[PDB]
Design a protein around this nucleic acid. Structure first.
Ligand SMILES: [Mg+2]
Ligand SMILES: [Mg+2]
Ligand SMILES: [Mg+2]
Ligand SMILES: [Mg+2]
Ligand SMILES: [Mg+2]
Ligand SMILES: [Mg+2]
Ligand SMILES: [Mg+2]
Ligand SMILES: [Mg+2]
Ligand SMILES: [Mg+2]
Ligand SMILES: [Mg+2]
Ligand SMILES: [Mg+2]
Ligand SMILES: [Mg+2]
Ligand SMILES: [Mg+2]
Ligand SMILES: [Mg+2]
Ligand SMILES: [Mg+2]
Ligand SMILES: [Mg+2]
Ligand SMILES: [Mg+2]
Ligand SMILES: [Mg+2]
Ligand SMILES: [Mg+2]
Ligand SMILES: [Mg+2]
Ligand SMILES: [Mg+2]
Ligand SMILES: [Mg+2]
Ligand SMILES: [Mg+2]
Ligand SMILES: [Mg+2]
Ligand SMILES: [Mg+2]
Ligand SMILES: [Mg+2]
Ligand SMILES: [Mg+2]
Ligand SMILES: [Mg+2]
Ligand SMILES: [Mg+2]
Ligand SMILES: [Mg+2]
Ligand SMILES: [Mg+2]
Ligand SMILES: [Mg+2]
Ligand SMILES: [Mg+2]
Ligand SMILES: [Mg+2]
Ligand SMILES: [Mg+2]
Ligand SMILES: [Mg+2]
Ligand SMILES: [Mg+2]
Ligand SMILES: [Mg+2]
Ligand SMILES: [Mg+2]
Ligand SMILES: [Mg+2]
Ligand SMILES: [Mg+2]
Ligand SMILES: [Mg+2]
Ligand SMILES: [Mg+2]
Ligand SMILES: [Mg+2]
Ligand SMILES: [Mg+2]
Ligand SMILES: [Mg+2]
Ligand SMILES: [Mg+2]
Ligand SMILES: [Mg+2]
Ligand SMILES: [Mg+2]
Ligand SMILES: [Mg+2]
Ligand SMILES: [Mg+2]
Ligand SMILES: [Mg+2]
Ligand SMILES: [Mg+2]
Ligand SMILES: [Mg+2]
Ligand SMILES: [Mg+2]
Ligand SMILES: [Mg+2]
Ligand SMILES: [Mg+2]
Ligand SMILES: [Mg+2]
Ligand SMILES: [Mg+2]
Ligand SMILES: [Mg+2]
Ligand SMILES: [Mg+2]
Ligand SMILES: [Mg+2]
Ligand SMILES: [Mg+2]
Ligand SMILES: [Mg+2]
Ligand SMILES: [Mg+2]
Ligand SMILES: [Mg+2]
Ligand SMILES: [Mg+2]
Ligand SMILES: [Mg+2]
Ligand SMILES: [Mg+2]
Ligand SMILES: [Mg+2]
Ligand SMILES: [Mg+2]
Ligand SMILES: [Mg+2]
Ligand SMILES: [Mg+2]
Ligand SMILES: [Mg+2]
Ligand SMILES: [Mg+2]
Ligand SMILES: [Mg+2]
Ligand SMILES: [Mg+2]
Ligand SMILES: [Mg+2]
Ligand SMILES: [Mg+2]
Ligand SMILES: [Mg+2]
Ligand SMILES: [Mg+2]
Ligand SMILES: [Mg+2]
Ligand SMILES: [Mg+2]
Ligand SMILES: [Mg+2]
Ligand SMILES: [Mg+2]
Ligand SMILES: [Mg+2]
Ligand SMILES: [Mg+2]
Ligand SMILES: [Mg+2]
Ligand SMILES: [Mg+2]
Ligand SMILES: [Mg+2]
Ligand SMILES: [Mg+2]
Ligand SMILES: [Mg+2]
Ligand SMILES: [Mg+2]
Ligand SMILES: [Mg+2]
Ligand SMILES: [Mg+2]
Ligand SMILES: [Mg+2]
Ligand SMILES: [Mg+2]
Ligand SMILES: [Mg+2]
Ligand SMILES: [Mg+2]
Ligand SMILES: [Mg+2]
Ligand SMILES: [Mg+2]
Ligand SMILES: [Mg+2]
Ligand SMILES: [Mg+2]
Ligand SMILES: [Mg+2]
Ligand SMILES: [Mg+2]
Ligand SMILES: [Mg+2]
Ligand SMILES: [Mg+2]
Ligand SMILES: [Mg+2]
Ligand SMILES: [Mg+2]
Ligand SMILES: [Mg+2]
Ligand SMILES: [Mg+2]
Ligand SMILES: [Mg+2]
Ligand SMILES: [Mg+2]
Ligand SMILES: [Mg+2]
Ligand SMILES: [Mg+2]
Ligand SMILES: [Mg+2]
Ligand SMILES: [Mg+2]
Ligand SMILES: [Mg+2]
Ligand SMILES: [Mg+2]
Ligand SMILES: [Mg+2]
Ligand SMILES: [Mg+2]
Ligand SMILES: [Mg+2]
Ligand SMILES: [Mg+2]
Ligand SMILES: [Mg+2]
Ligand SMILES: [Mg+2]
Ligand SMILES: [Mg+2]
Ligand SMILES: [Mg+2]
Ligand SMILES: [Mg+2]
Ligand SMILES: [Mg+2]
Ligand SMILES: [Mg+2]
Ligand SMILES: [Mg+2]
Ligand SMILES: [Mg+2]
Ligand SMILES: [Mg+2]
Ligand SMILES: [Mg+2]
Ligand SMILES: [Mg+2]
Ligand SMILES: [Mg+2]
Ligand SMILES: [Mg+2]
Ligand SMILES: [Mg+2]
Ligand SMILES: [Mg+2]
Ligand SMILES: [Mg+2]
Ligand SMILES: [Mg+2]
Ligand SMILES: [Mg+2]
Ligand SMILES: [Mg+2]
Ligand SMILES: [Mg+2]
Ligand SMILES: [Mg+2]
Ligand SMILES: [Mg+2]
Ligand SMILES: [Mg+2]
Ligand SMILES: [Mg+2]
Ligand SMILES: [Mg+2]
Ligand SMILES: [Mg+2]
Ligand SMILES: [Mg+2]
Ligand SMILES: [Mg+2]
Ligand SMILES: [Mg+2]
Ligand SMILES: [Mg+2]
Ligand SMILES: [Mg+2]
Ligand SMILES: [Mg+2]
Ligand SMILES: [Mg+2]
Ligand SMILES: [Mg+2]
Ligand SMILES: [Mg+2]
Ligand SMILES: [Mg+2]
Ligand SMILES: [Mg+2]
Ligand SMILES: [Mg+2]
Ligand SMILES: [Mg+2]
Ligand SMILES: [Mg+2]
Ligand SMILES: [Mg+2]
Ligand SMILES: [Mg+2]
Ligand SMILES: [Mg+2]
Ligand SMILES: [Mg+2]
Ligand SMILES: [Mg+2]
Ligand SMILES: [Mg+2]
Ligand SMILES: [Mg+2]
Ligand SMILES: [Mg+2]
Ligand SMILES: [Mg+2]
Ligand SMILES: [Mg+2]
Ligand SMILES: [Mg+2]
Ligand SMILES: [Mg+2]
Ligand SMILES: [Mg+2]
Ligand SMILES: [Mg+2]
Ligand SMILES: [Mg+2]
Ligand SMILES: [Mg+2]
Ligand SMILES: [Mg+2]
Ligand SMILES: [Mg+2]
Ligand SMILES: [Mg+2]
Ligand SMILES: [Mg+2]
Ligand SMILES: [Mg+2]
Ligand SMILES: [Mg+2]
Ligand SMILES: [Mg+2]
Ligand SMILES: [Mg+2]
Ligand SMILES: [Mg+2]
Ligand SMILES: [Mg+2]
Ligand SMILES: [Mg+2]
Ligand SMILES: [Mg+2]
Ligand SMILES: [Mg+2]
Ligand SMILES: [Mg+2]
Ligand SMILES: [Mg+2]
Ligand SMILES: [Mg+2]
Ligand SMILES: [Mg+2]
Ligand SMILES: [Mg+2]
Ligand SMILES: [Mg+2]
Ligand SMILES: [Mg+2]
Ligand SMILES: [Mg+2]
Ligand SMILES: [Mg+2]
Ligand SMILES: [Mg+2]
Ligand SMILES: [Mg+2]
Ligand SMILES: [Mg+2]
Ligand SMILES: [Mg+2]
Ligand SMILES: [Mg+2]
Ligand SMILES: [Mg+2]
Ligand SMILES: [Mg+2]
Ligand SMILES: [Mg+2]
Ligand SMILES: [Mg+2]
Ligand SMILES: [Mg+2]
Ligand SMILES: [Mg+2]
Ligand SMILES: [Mg+2]
Ligand SMILES: [Mg+2]
Ligand SMILES: [Mg+2]
Ligand SMILES: [Mg+2]
Ligand SMILES: [Mg+2]
Ligand SMILES: [Mg+2]
Ligand SMILES: [Mg+2]
Ligand SMILES: [Mg+2]
Ligand SMILES: [Mg+2]
Ligand SMILES: [Zn+2]
Lengths: 107, 97, 70, 95
RNA sequence: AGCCGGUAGCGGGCGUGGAUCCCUGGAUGUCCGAAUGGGGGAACCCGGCCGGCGGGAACGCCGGUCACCGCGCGCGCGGGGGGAACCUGGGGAACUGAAACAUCUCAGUACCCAGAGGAGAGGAAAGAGAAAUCGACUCCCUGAGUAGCGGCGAGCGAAAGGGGACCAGCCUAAACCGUCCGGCUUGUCCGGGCGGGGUCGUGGGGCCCUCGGACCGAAUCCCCAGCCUAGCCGAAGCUGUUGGGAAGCAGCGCCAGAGAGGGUGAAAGCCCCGUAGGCGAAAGGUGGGGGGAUAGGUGAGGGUACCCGAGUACCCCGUGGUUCGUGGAGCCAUGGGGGAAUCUGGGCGGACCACCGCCUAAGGCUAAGUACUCCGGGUGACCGAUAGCGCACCAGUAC
RNA sequence: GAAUGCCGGCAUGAGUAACGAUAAAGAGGGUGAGAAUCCCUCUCGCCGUAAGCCCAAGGGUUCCUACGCAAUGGUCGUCAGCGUAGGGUUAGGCGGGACCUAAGGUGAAGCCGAAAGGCGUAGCCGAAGGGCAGCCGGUUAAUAUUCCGGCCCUUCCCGCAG
RNA sequence: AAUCCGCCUCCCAACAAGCUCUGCGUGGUGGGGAAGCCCGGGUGACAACCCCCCGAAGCCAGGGAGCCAAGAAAAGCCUCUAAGCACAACCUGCGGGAACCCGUACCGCAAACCGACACAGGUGGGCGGGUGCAAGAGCACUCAGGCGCGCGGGAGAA
């Protein structure tokens, strides 16, 4: 019915694995269909561009490449630690993501 | 060659069994079957034309149920049949079956 | 169209009479043609407006059918 | 609901169709099932003119392909309407 | 919390004032198709009637309606066509086997047709058949390759009984009574409706006396639980190191009603999707379970001999079914001819007769246990792109 | 490892046969990366009861224009019935339908058949037959009895007069 | 049913005329218009547009004669009347309005149709000029128009 994403634009996440493991950054975009996230200044690649109106002088540009969403862990705005997410039901009675280490909302 | 309108008798399939030889009960060696082939047995259908409520009604009926047509006419005397077409009259007669 | 504008469109529509809905649909189908004509000569950069009007017309006719259905 | 604007789809954009404006002949893409009598009314109520003559012809869609996939463009129908002496359709006068 | 299908792009938009997306219901739904106003070479063409639109009468468009057949007092209801197998009925081969072939086999199979439905058929003894017996029907095991059948060749092949699955029994016809209708040959008349009554084999029922005046309960209807059609919560890991990458190796931990499994840059219980264990429906479907209505259900003797399904039983002729191929050939079915009786009547127990028993024909219905797999799911000492479906891919396509 | 096995791949024959009518070519100029093969001009030959023109079948965009040349074209290709794209088919009078009937087909009534179905006067359907009102010229890259021009005509509706 | 048609009789008429319909000619009017040399178009050009001859298998046509094998139907059309209706209706003239659907490109004896091919095969109807040869749709050449057949260049054996 829908792809389960434990992370969203643009909370702050730890990149827990890969060349950029340990890195922290905001989530620029989420791409459920590839089950992937874009994280700021993480997974940078050199992309060739043609001499064009968009890119006069041409050459290369830098791009953030998607990250498999499982490689990424949200950082708790409360206790400032990387955490798994839990669901909590409010009085509202809406449901929210909350940190597993402490109990703070992640939104 | 068809169906009895009264009884619903219809053609049936039967074998025609050709036999040679002397039956055992007559001291013979026994009966031998020299051929079996399908054929049909027909009801003995005939036309019965009958006057009912001033209109001519005809039934196609196996001879066995010829007297049945008359029973229907007799029982028909309690029916409002005047003015009706032969088809409707027939339908009414058959209803009484 | 914005969700809020859709909500409002249906509210106002449901207050209109069958006769007013017909007149309105007629005018919106006229505007649709005008949009088609513009898109045809490459003078409609806001091409999303075509789909929008089409769905408005559908919403209008849906309510028209609502009114007449009882 | 059926309106004149369901009948008249688009103007025909071509050097042949433009050549007609001079003598008051305007050429439209119309709904393929639309009648000459129907188109006359539709053009008249849409553009406020008087239609004196209507010519129609069906235009078969061209067969086309993207790589392996053979297909057809939709069939169309076009109408040439003659407006009354001195009248004009400014929408098409355009150009 | 993203989104405007596969699908990026151009050019433009939408979403926490809850979008995209998923489920349910509704709306719209050109034309053809049973196709049904009529015609037709399917997807086109041409009309009647009513109402509307345009200047509109000619012309055209929009809405409504108009086929035929069956049943029921012009109008109502129903029918038509489709569905992978499965089912029942009406018809029904041949190769082949018999080491030739004709009876026989294949086989009541393949196939054609009609019909049915989520099943269908069958079903409440005119049964079985030897037990002083059993007790509707269906289905599985068995009985049993027995009994038998058979150019007594090739081959074919039961049933009772026993063990199980399921379990359920009802409605009529006739006697007699009431009423309405019509026939004409006037009544204690005959006939056709409808209602009451009645439903059985220890025979039952009717009628007439005579004694006696609440419990059962649906297979129908109502409510409900439960289920299906979307979903939701869900424990516990960090560091170093090699490496493009760790989940490998090392150190120190932790969860476990969860160590099924799939992912993540390599080999991860603790990163992700999940798993164990739990949670969930406003709407529609289902509801065989629970609750409740309703229909229906019910004595005893005594006398009377009124009734107890007709072109039927029964006999003969022709044939089918059964294990039974004419055989001593019954039973069940019936195309032809003849042709009864109402319980002191009738059918059966393998010619026939006697005795002794069994059973109640010629009206109808009836869940469940059984079959199948288009569809959804689960699982393989199943396949892994010449395999596995003909198709992993835009295939019943190209050709 | 064999089944003239099956599917696929690739060899041999072999730079071989052949390149599809013996109507036939030559030169100059142009285009272009490239020219016997495309365009233009001159010369030559071939058809001319056709190898020319028009119509009906059938085919279905092959038409016109621009841009192309990997494949298709029996060579070549700058060309093309090929690739991409845009354009192009205009009717009261032409053809068919809103008219008729032919064989035949269907089929009220009706008849027959195990089922499916077979027939069947009328009616209906059925044409390249009957019937019915447009000729000449001009115009487009591409349609023309259709657009335009001139001169004619038909039916239906309504009205007026007789 | 009929005043129509058929049959009988009488009276005028009759290779006549008349009435009607078609073909061809003319006809207000609208068009077209060559070679040639000029870059499909301009000019030629104010183009001319006349006479004679030949002449259809086509037209008048539903013509004529002969023959035996004896040669569709139905509608349109006309006439007759029936219900009806005779303020209607139909007929003639005139006027205004109205006049829908589908086809129309292109190939079409062929490289676009049937033959697996741009295939020496097959494909129904019409036009098919001129000169000469007795005629002709034959034959030879040639007009208009269309082509040289989608591998070539050499060589000069069997
Ligand atoms: Mg979720
Ligand atoms: Mg890691
Ligand atoms: Mg680190
Ligand atoms: Mg919520
Ligand atoms: Mg016999
Ligand atoms: Mg004997
Ligand atoms: Mg003896
Ligand atoms: Mg024998
Ligand atoms: Mg007879
Ligand atoms: Mg008789
Ligand atoms: Mg008999
Ligand atoms: Mg008899
Ligand atoms: Mg919406
Ligand atoms: Mg609509
Ligand atoms: Mg032009
Ligand atoms: Mg209109
Ligand atoms: Mg047209
Ligand atoms: Mg398309
Ligand atoms: Mg898209
Ligand atoms: Mg963009
Ligand atoms: Mg909500
Ligand atoms: Mg829906
Ligand atoms: Mg439509
Ligand atoms: Mg339809
Ligand atoms: Mg129809
Ligand atoms: Mg029909
Ligand atoms: Mg009307
Ligand atoms: Mg108007
Ligand atoms: Mg009108
Ligand atoms: Mg209509
Ligand atoms: Mg209609
Ligand atoms: Mg049927
Ligand atoms: Mg059915
Ligand atoms: Mg059977
Ligand atoms: Mg049957
Ligand atoms: Mg049979
Ligand atoms: Mg069968
Ligand atoms: Mg046979
Ligand atoms: Mg045999
Ligand atoms: Mg065999
Ligand atoms: Mg065998
Ligand atoms: Mg054998
Ligand atoms: Mg044999
Ligand atoms: Mg043998
Ligand atoms: Mg033999
Ligand atoms: Mg045999
Ligand atoms: Mg058999
Ligand atoms: Mg089978
Ligand atoms: Mg069926
Ligand atoms: Mg079941
Ligand atoms: Mg049943
Ligand atoms: Mg019983
Ligand atoms: Mg034993
Ligand atoms: Mg057998
Ligand atoms: Mg048993
Ligand atoms: Mg048992
Ligand atoms: Mg069980
Ligand atoms: Mg029981
Ligand atoms: Mg009476
Ligand atoms: Mg009686
Ligand atoms: Mg009585
Ligand atoms: Mg009575
Ligand atoms: Mg008794
Ligand atoms: Mg019951
Ligand atoms: Mg979870
Ligand atoms: Mg977890
Ligand atoms: Mg490595
Ligand atoms: Mg490293
Ligand atoms: Mg690590
Ligand atoms: Mg470890
Ligand atoms: Mg487990
Ligand atoms: Mg595992
Ligand atoms: Mg795993
Ligand atoms: Mg491991
Ligand atoms: Mg492993
Ligand atoms: Mg794992
Ligand atoms: Mg569970
Ligand atoms: Mg669960
Ligand atoms: Mg009782
Ligand atoms: Mg008693
Ligand atoms: Mg008695
Ligand atoms: Mg009985
Ligand atoms: Mg009876
Ligand atoms: Mg017998
Ligand atoms: Mg037998
Ligand atoms: Mg027998
Ligand atoms: Mg014997
Ligand atoms: Mg026997
Ligand atoms: Mg006996
Ligand atoms: Mg018998
Ligand atoms: Mg009999
Ligand atoms: Mg007895
Ligand atoms: Mg007796
Ligand atoms: Mg008996
Ligand atoms: Mg007997
Ligand atoms: Mg017995
Ligand atoms: Mg005995
Ligand atoms: Mg006895
Ligand atoms: Mg018994
Ligand atoms: Mg039954
Ligand atoms: Mg039950
Ligand atoms: Mg059942
Ligand atoms: Mg069952
Ligand atoms: Mg099953
Ligand atoms: Mg499955
Ligand atoms: Mg394997
Ligand atoms: Mg595997
Ligand atoms: Mg493969
Ligand atoms: Mg395969
Ligand atoms: Mg492989
Ligand atoms: Mg396969
Ligand atoms: Mg599949
Ligand atoms: Mg395959
Ligand atoms: Mg395949
Ligand atoms: Mg394919
Ligand atoms: Mg070997
Ligand atoms: Mg070989
Ligand atoms: Mg070989
Ligand atoms: Mg060999
Ligand atoms: Mg081989
Ligand atoms: Mg091999
Ligand atoms: Mg092979
Ligand atoms: Mg090979
Ligand atoms: Mg080699
Ligand atoms: Mg080779
Ligand atoms: Mg060589
Ligand atoms: Mg050689
Ligand atoms: Mg050689
Ligand atoms: Mg050679
Ligand atoms: Mg040759
Ligand atoms: Mg050659
Ligand atoms: Mg040159
Ligand atoms: Mg040159
Ligand atoms: Mg060249
Ligand atoms: Mg070249
Ligand atoms: Mg050239
Ligand atoms: Mg020549
Ligand atoms: Mg000549
Ligand atoms: Mg054509
Ligand atoms: Mg073709
Ligand atoms: Mg093409
Ligand atoms: Mg063209
Ligand atoms: Mg083209
Ligand atoms: Mg061309
Ligand atoms: Mg070019
Ligand atoms: Mg090429
Ligand atoms: Mg090339
Ligand atoms: Mg090339
Ligand atoms: Mg290319
Ligand atoms: Mg090639
Ligand atoms: Mg080539
Ligand atoms: Mg070739
Ligand atoms: Mg070039
Ligand atoms: Mg070409
Ligand atoms: Mg092209
Ligand atoms: Mg163009
Ligand atoms: Mg015209
Ligand atoms: Mg016509
Ligand atoms: Mg009409
Ligand atoms: Mg017609
Ligand atoms: Mg007709
Ligand atoms: Mg009939
Ligand atoms: Mg027929
Ligand atoms: Mg006929
Ligand atoms: Mg007709
Ligand atoms: Mg016709
Ligand atoms: Mg015709
Ligand atoms: Mg004709
Ligand atoms: Mg005509
Ligand atoms: Mg004319
Ligand atoms: Mg042309
Ligand atoms: Mg053109
Ligand atoms: Mg004109
Ligand atoms: Mg008058
Ligand atoms: Mg008379
Ligand atoms: Mg007279
Ligand atoms: Mg007269
Ligand atoms: Mg003239
Ligand atoms: Mg004249
Ligand atoms: Mg002049
Ligand atoms: Mg000139
Ligand atoms: Mg000139
Ligand atoms: Mg001049
Ligand atoms: Mg001059
Ligand atoms: Mg002069
Ligand atoms: Mg001649
Ligand atoms: Mg003559
Ligand atoms: Mg003769
Ligand atoms: Mg006729
Ligand atoms: Mg007629
Ligand atoms: Mg009168
Ligand atoms: Mg008159
Ligand atoms: Mg007029
Ligand atoms: Mg029409
Ligand atoms: Mg058209
Ligand atoms: Mg054309
Ligand atoms: Mg043409
Ligand atoms: Mg042409
Ligand atoms: Mg050609
Ligand atoms: Mg041509
Ligand atoms: Mg030829
Ligand atoms: Mg020809
Ligand atoms: Mg040609
Ligand atoms: Mg071809
Ligand atoms: Mg060809
Ligand atoms: Mg060639
Ligand atoms: Mg050829
Ligand atoms: Mg020929
Ligand atoms: Mg000529
Ligand atoms: Mg001559
Ligand atoms: Mg000569
Ligand atoms: Mg000569
Ligand atoms: Mg000549
Ligand atoms: Mg000759
Ligand atoms: Mg010649
Ligand atoms: Mg010659
Ligand atoms: Mg000449
Ligand atoms: Mg020439
Ligand atoms: Mg040549
Ligand atoms: Mg050649
Ligand atoms: Mg050449
Ligand atoms: Mg040489
Ligand atoms: Zn926290």
């Amino acid at each position: 019915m829908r792809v389960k994403m434990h992370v969203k634009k643009g909370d702050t996440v730890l990149v827990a694995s890969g060349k950029y493991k340990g890195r922290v950054g905001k989530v620029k975009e989420v791409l459920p269909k590839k089950y992937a996230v874009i994280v700021e200044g993480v997974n940078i690649v050199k992309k060739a561009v043609r001499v064009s109106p968009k890119y006069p002088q041409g050459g290369f540009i830098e791009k953030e490449a998607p990250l498999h969403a499982s490689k990424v862990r949200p950082i708790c705005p409360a206790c400032g630690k990387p955490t798994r997410v839990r669901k909590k039901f409010l009085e509202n009675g809406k449901k929210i993501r909350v940190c597993a280490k402490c109990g703070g909302a992640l939104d | 060659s068809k169906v009895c309108e009264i009884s619903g008798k219809r053609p049936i399939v039967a074998n025609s069994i050709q036999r040679r030889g002397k039956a055992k009960r007559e001291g013979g060696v026994g009966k031998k079957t020299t051929g079996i082939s399908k054929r049909r047995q027909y009801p003995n259908l005939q036309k019965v034309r009958v006057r009912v409520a001033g209109q001519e009604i005809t039934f196609r009926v196996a001879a066995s149920h010829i007297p049945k047509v008359y029973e229907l006419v007799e029982r028909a005397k309690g029916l409002k049949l005047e003015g009706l077409s032969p088809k409707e009259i027939k339908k009414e007669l058959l209803k009484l079956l | 169209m914005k969700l809020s504008e859709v909500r409002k469109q249906l509210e106002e529509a449901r207050k209109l009479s069958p006769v007013e809905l017909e007149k309105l649909v007629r005018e919106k189908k006229r505007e649709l043609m005008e949009l088609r004509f513009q898109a045809s000569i490459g003078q409609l950069s806001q091409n999303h407006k075509i789909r929008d009007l089409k769905r408005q017309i559908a919403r209008l006719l849906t309510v028209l059918n609502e009114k007449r259905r009882q | 609901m059926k309106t004149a604007y369901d009948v008249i789809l688009a103007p025909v954009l071509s050097e042949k169709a433009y050549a007609g404006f001079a003598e008051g002949k305007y050429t439209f893409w119309v709904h393929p099932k639309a009648t000459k009598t129907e188109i006359k009314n539709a053009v008249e109520t849409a553009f406020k003119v008087k239609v004196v003559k209507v010519n129609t012809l069906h235009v078969r869609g061209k067969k086309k392909r993207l790589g392996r996939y053979l297909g057809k463009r939709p069939d169309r129908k076009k109408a040439i309407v003659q407006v009354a002496p001195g009248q004009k359709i400014e929408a098409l006068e355009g150009l």
